[PDB]
Design a protein around this ligand. Structure first.
Ligand SMILES: NC(=O)c1ccc[n+]([C@@H]2O[C@H](COP(=O)([O-])OP(=O)(O)OC[C@H]3O[C@@H](n4cnc5c(N)ncnc54)[C@H](O)[C@@H]3O)[C@@H](O)[C@H]2O)c1
Ligand SMILES: NC(=O)c1ccc[n+]([C@@H]2O[C@H](COP(=O)([O-])OP(=O)(O)OC[C@H]3O[C@@H](n4cnc5c(N)ncnc54)[C@H](O)[C@@H]3O)[C@@H](O)[C@H]2O)c1
Ligand SMILES: NC(=O)c1ccc[n+]([C@H]2O[C@@H](COP(=O)([O-])OP(=O)(O)OC[C@H]3O[C@@H](n4cnc5c(N)ncnc54)[C@H](O)[C@@H]3O)[C@@H](O)[C@@H]2O)c1
Ligand SMILES: NC(=O)c1ccc[n+]([C@H]2O[C@@H](COP(=O)([O-])OP(=O)(O)OC[C@H]3O[C@@H](n4cnc5c(N)ncnc54)[C@H](O)[C@@H]3O)[C@@H](O)[C@H]2O)c1
Ligand SMILES: *[C@](O)([C@H](C)CCc1occc1C)[C@@]1(O)[C@H]2[C@@H](CC[C@@H]2C)[C@H](C)[C@]2(O)OC[C@H](C)C[C@]12O
Ligand SMILES: [Cl-]
Ligand SMILES: [Cl-]
Ligand SMILES: [Cl-]
Ligand SMILES: [Cl-]
Ligand SMILES: [Cl-]
Ligand SMILES: [Zn+2]
Ligand SMILES: [Zn+2]
Ligand SMILES: [Zn+2]
Ligand SMILES: [Zn+2]
Ligand SMILES: [Zn+2]
Ligand SMILES: [Zn+2]
Ligand SMILES: [Zn+2]
Lengths: 334, 333, 336, 333
């Protein structure tokens, strides 16, 4: 009954999707491809995690396979995704978590080796994009190549849904203060396409472009063209925050806003959108599996139509859990 | 050159003194700090993790601190009232401690025979200035005055240009702020401000700030039209303001760029910077601007609703302003 | 006569909170009272519940009827600056953990006896109290000793390793560096530290050399090494976990594989839980929340020759030490 | 002044260039990087998170990089053997890419008409030099050489003074070293060196290093008598050496201080520094010494067994030594 899954790119997201799948039992990981991490290295990289701690389970190399909690995983080492024998390994869905194959054309290479469906762990220029709790019911069986959007979109869209559903968003500008990621550099280094992203990640606050707010208008079509934003990368290793400045169509007191977010967090968006009035800081959300946790005490309203709302997200662990949730929902529809 | 005294030799005290000797706009003659003896003052002024070693000379001679060959008198006097300023020849005096922010508690410097007191911080009830915005509203009647905060000094110059040209209907500000001395290394006690106790290396920390409201006190027309909040992040210096605002008259982003650029080259030269370069925070380390507009970092949704980004070295910009203020108060004497 | 000793904690800080956490996790002692004039009851709930380094408390914690209630156990809360005025006896606290950092002499720590505590355990080195390292000299504790010290995090890392090396090969002389995480004594940005100037400098920006008596202290808990060790520290910008680097000359020849064998044997037997052993390609975060006093890193050390070696051992300076405070108190209880 | 080509405009190539223009000791006339276009070189050279904005001018002009008014020929060759150094007039080439560290690979620059190559890293086969210690062993027969590492350049000058005066029987070195470009921001792949893949911001990371053993090549009397290891820690620049050594002759700590201080003022001036100040790592940012002995930080167990501490700006000290080595080579012809 559980869908069998293959992971392309055993990185932060590849490893934590694997970790999430084994922790939740919602899907079964049967194959991993990563040309830059051999089998014995995968054991080490999966077992020890600077951010989320040692894996709670067993991992070893046995008979040329990676065995997680007694479950053997076929390991591939292919640079070219069209050459990965997913079908032979029994992988039905492929998580595409390399960062380099994000178009439907590129991600579609996995169909050549026998995958049935591909879930891109990032925004896509052209794939249908999903955020669990917001538009995952728009998924249908005709969609072989889909995107789970970004961490930032998965934080903003559940909050935006609640605000838009209750009061309407006329227009919104978003900032995300975002943890450093593997794309950044330790010291000033080369990033020919994006100069600021080459600058030393430990030393700097680094402004960066993001399509994450615009993307919310693709997962919530009524908000198409009504949102945009940007990011600052800062020197923390995990956990990020969204700051949405928006104008509301209908007036809302800040306590009205709190009430509808809290109600959504306790009912239909349970496990997706969280709600806190605690005096939280970023490390309080390390390994928190929500997509989005609204911080009641941190936001501020100028008036009943113009507000700044704050939501936290563990950019690694919330998203990884969402990738697994999406695949479980896809499988239920087969 | 007016002759100046400093109460506290903390980051602002030291950096005002540094700015005073580097600019040569004013001239320091006295300092007071109980948690800090003369020999220790030499070391704290000479070496600085953030801004580097002082360019010049500093020594203890005859019980005075001597900077670039200039003797300075050193009080230890635990109570501001008890501060023999006039003795030392301190015309104006900078209140850098920030537990004497009110006008009464900081009136105390008048008791010691000091003429006029520039406070290095927001005040509940004193007249706040920001150079380039409302300093031309200083006349001689004024004693205890405020130079506002670092963040207000970043936000107000940009707000002035944007309001002057397009009108700000309303705005909400975020500052992403480097760590400060009020934060803790590891989770520790901050009983009035619990989030501020949490370890500063490990955390993004949301914080209240009155800086955006305060803009409405130096720019009366923006009173009640701005508020905001902050995030403390684990960098050692240089902060950024993110102002999201709704404009009355429509403005293409290229028009916003044009007016900010004009202002930076003209009347706000030295105060409001303008760049289109692909900058990051450390590029503004020891930059003496109040506010530098980052053209490439900002983003418009439409002609009425825009997000504008401005950098400030929270330590250094402000310190230079406190000196600039005194040079300008000296020309009004 | 004495069963599970009841404990009071003076100073609810990193160590006071994590000793509390260790006591509830291990069950070895019962925390019945806490004193901190800088953290009121509602604030204690928050500071205990959420921890940047070690994560949310796995249990329940709340305030009710003026008590702190942890895992349903009510704890009496005091707010006294002067330790002679804390009513430990009325609250049922028998041993007191003196974890403020400002009462480390037998005379200052002994203030707790005035309010009815029976014994005091100073969570730091002491100029005059008997000092103990679990696994090394705790069996030298006797019930005549009412005020004692559990030494420092660093001494608890070095001593168990120094014991094994000395016992097997003989240490002629040794010099130790500890590369140590930042602590609450340091500053976020350059600020005043009148007696220790370097310690005022910004903790996030700098490597900061600091004196430490931790190596010299090993010669007090292992008398045969008296005057044979000393060392120093560098503070670096990590929030927790530290490492000891011991360079020593050995009396008998020791191949590195022999050193590894005897450490592994000690870690598996008499020093189990105290001294660990690994050959894994570890880094500091791998020991976050690790309860060992000392984990020998086989791959990180290096021998110049059979008599001159550099040995590396990791320690969670918060969590290893806090567990050791609990362990020592339960040992003390067993000897009443 | 000898004319110099720089292969690779990473951190070393950039700071060698900066050292060259700052000191004036050599004339940079060409730079090769296949990966980094001219406009991007301007940006990478002008702005530096660690050392600040370049003190001077830099611009693109007529297809050349122009620094302080000096045009520099820019190449974009993947294959070192194809770089036309001769046509650009580059006599010596600094091989700073990190991937051409053997004599076979480094020697490709000679095919394009370079006369000598200086590898800005340890080499498995090129002779290694440390200025102040064995640079007088350089001779005109040596067409391809190495300037060793930043750590060897720190340890060797201190080891030389101690050995010369007291004799080193045996020594073990630890270096607590700032992060570098080879590390990762979060846990990532490093297949030959698993610990070095782990997040550099989060971790103390132990690493093997031949830097201490290498001292036995530049000081042959110490062959087999020194080794050590490194800890990478989350600071962005400046490192420190901790040398634990047994001495043949007795030495009071105060005798150690005297001989290091004399060395710092005489033959090793500018190379080996000496301080009794209460320094921390940031006090050495942009310091051009190879090695600064920290008198206050070290400790003696006895007259024969000591721990000595010496700071080094791994970037700036080393880059200045590459320039100084080239000036010394130029002095021989
Ligand atoms: N905070 C986050 O990291 C985050 C959150 C949500 C989504 N994502 C997205 O998920 C993707 C991966 O994110 P990440 O942080 O884990 O980066 P990452 O660098 O850790 O992932 C790359 C991994 O895939 C492997 N890989 C690289 N090229 C490959 C190839 N050609 N074939 C197979 N494997 C290859 C890498 O060696 C590495 O193990 C990115 O698109 C990223 O933006 C990231
Ligand atoms: N890595 C470590 O933190 C570590 C490891 C081993 C031992 N120790 C030792 O344990 C002691 C505490 O270490 P720490 O890191 O937790 O420091 P800390 O600052 O976190 O502990 C101080 C706590 O006690 C409270 N306190 C202060 N003065 C008090 C008083 N007069 N009465 C009652 N309570 C008071 C503080 O408000 C604070 O809550 C120190 O001596 C320290 O060196 C610390
Ligand atoms: N001893 C060795 O065997 C060895 C091995 C690897 C690296 N290294 C050396 O690297 C040194 C300096 O490092 P850094 O901190 O400046 O690193 P860096 O990454 O900042 O500089 C490397 C630069 O070389 C450039 N580069 C890469 N390939 C190139 C090519 N084919 N042609 C021209 N340029 C190219 C890159 O653009 C990059 O900017 C030392 O760490 C170390 O000595 C040495
Ligand atoms: N409105 C506000 O936001 C607010 C609130 C409180 C304080 N403050 C002030 O506090 C300062 C913080 O800036 P900082 O970086 O200089 O902090 P800081 O900690 O470095 O400044 C304190 C310095 O003054 C010295 N000092 C302390 N008490 C003193 C006294 N009674 N008399 C004389 N000197 C004393 C300190 O020992 C220290 O050297 C102001 O810049 C300002 O922020 C402002
Ligand atoms: C220094 O820093 C060392 C050698 C890095 C690693 C190391 O430290 C001690 C022992 C080892 C093996 C450098 O690599 C510098 C590099 C950039 C930063 C980095 C820390 C400088 C500028 C360097 O010159 O590159 C050449 C080299 C091998 C050494 C180097 O100094
Ligand atoms: Cl865990
Ligand atoms: Cl309009
Ligand atoms: Cl936990
Ligand atoms: Cl400079
Ligand atoms: Cl002797
Ligand atoms: Zn309305
Ligand atoms: Zn300077
Ligand atoms: Zn004027
Ligand atoms: Zn022997
Ligand atoms: Zn026992
Ligand atoms: Zn001196
Ligand atoms: Zn010479």
């Amino acid at each position: 009954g559980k869908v069998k899954v293959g992971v392309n790119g055993f990185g932060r997201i590849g490893r934590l999707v694997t970790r999430a799948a084994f922790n939740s039992g919602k899907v079964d990981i049967v194959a991993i491809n990563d040309p830059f991490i051999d089998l014995n290295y995968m054991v080490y990289m999966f077992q020890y995690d600077s951010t989320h701690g040692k894996f709670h389970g067993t991992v070893k190399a046995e008979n040329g396979k990676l065995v997680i909690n007694g479950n053997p995983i076929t390991i591939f080492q292919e640079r070219d995704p069209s050459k990965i024998k997913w079908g032979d390994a029994g992988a039905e869905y492929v998580v595409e978590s390399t960062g380099v194959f994000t178009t439907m054309e590129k991600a579609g290479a996995h169909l050549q080796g026998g995958a049935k469906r591909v879930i891109i762990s990032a925004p896509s220029a052209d794939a249908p994009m999903f955020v669990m709790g917001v538009n995952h019911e728009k998924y249908d069986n005709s969609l072989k190549i889909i995107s789970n959007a970004s961490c930032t979109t998965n934080c903003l869209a559940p909050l935006a849904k609640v605000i838009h559903d209750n009061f309407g968003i006329v227009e919104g500008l978003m900032t995300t203060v975002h943890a450093i990621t593997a794309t950044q550099k330790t010291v000033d280094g080369p990033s020919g396409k994006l100069w600021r992203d080459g600058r030393g990640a430990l030393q700097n606050i680094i402004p960066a472009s993001t399509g994450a707010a615009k993307a919310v208008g693709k997962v919530i079509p009524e908000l198409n063209g009504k949102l945009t934003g940007m990011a600052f990368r800062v020197p923390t290793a995990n956990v990020s925050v969204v700051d949405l400045t928006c104008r509301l169509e209908k007036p809302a007191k800040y306590d009205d806003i709190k009430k509808v977010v809290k109600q959504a967090s306790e009912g239909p968006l349970k496990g997706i959108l969280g709600y806190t009035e605690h005096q939280v800081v970023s490390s309080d959300f390390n390994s928190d599996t929500h997509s989005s946790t609204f911080d009641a005490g941190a936001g501020i309203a100028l008036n009943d139509h113009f507000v700044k709302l704050i939501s936290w997200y563990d950019n690694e662990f919330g998203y990884s859990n969402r990738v697994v949730d999406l695949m479980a929902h896809m499988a239920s529809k087969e």
